[PDB]
């Protein structure tokens with residue numbers, strides 16, 4: 001038993017809600033919150049900009065030190081950093097950004113990172129301003145992640161569309 005509330009059960013392990021991931025994090029303080037990052041950990045907009053703003057830019061400061069030491073992530077890759085005031089840890093996951101011309105096949109690899117954590121609060125990878133088909137992303141999530149994932153979908157119309165079309 002965990003402390004997530006009001007989530008629609010989709011499969012044995014995936015749950016979904018129309019909510020802001022920052023507010024869910026502030027309420028639940030999960031072990032792991034997922035950021036929809038880019039390879040440079042430059043947290044400008046969407047999920048990343050919102051999470052970073054909620055940490056008062058501490059996420060960005062930590063991220064810049066990570067990149068200075070380790071270099072960029074791979075598309076499809078991830079790193080574990082602090083969750084600051086929002087969670088114990090933040091799993092920064094790089095899904096493909098279709099608006100950058102990145103390869104959508106890498107979405108499955110991106111979701112595989114979730115399997116290293118027993119429970120996660122996460123956004124829908126590569127949705128929104130990342131330019132991928134959100135129905136497809138949800139299918140890949142359910143068909144790839146085996147650990148317990150709680151998805152927070154920000155856009156109400158998107159949430160309604162995802163629920164109504166889910167197989």
Ligand SMILES: O=C(O)C[C@@H](NC(=O)c1cccc2ncnn12)c1ccc(F)cc1F
Nearest residue numbers: 020021036046047050126128129153154155
């Ligand atoms: O509407 C959506 O859920 C899709 C969209 N979400 C957000 O931008 C967002 C902004 C602030 C709080 C918040 N909580 C949950 N999502 N979310 C999105 C997802 C992945 C991505 F890589 C880029 C995106 F733009």
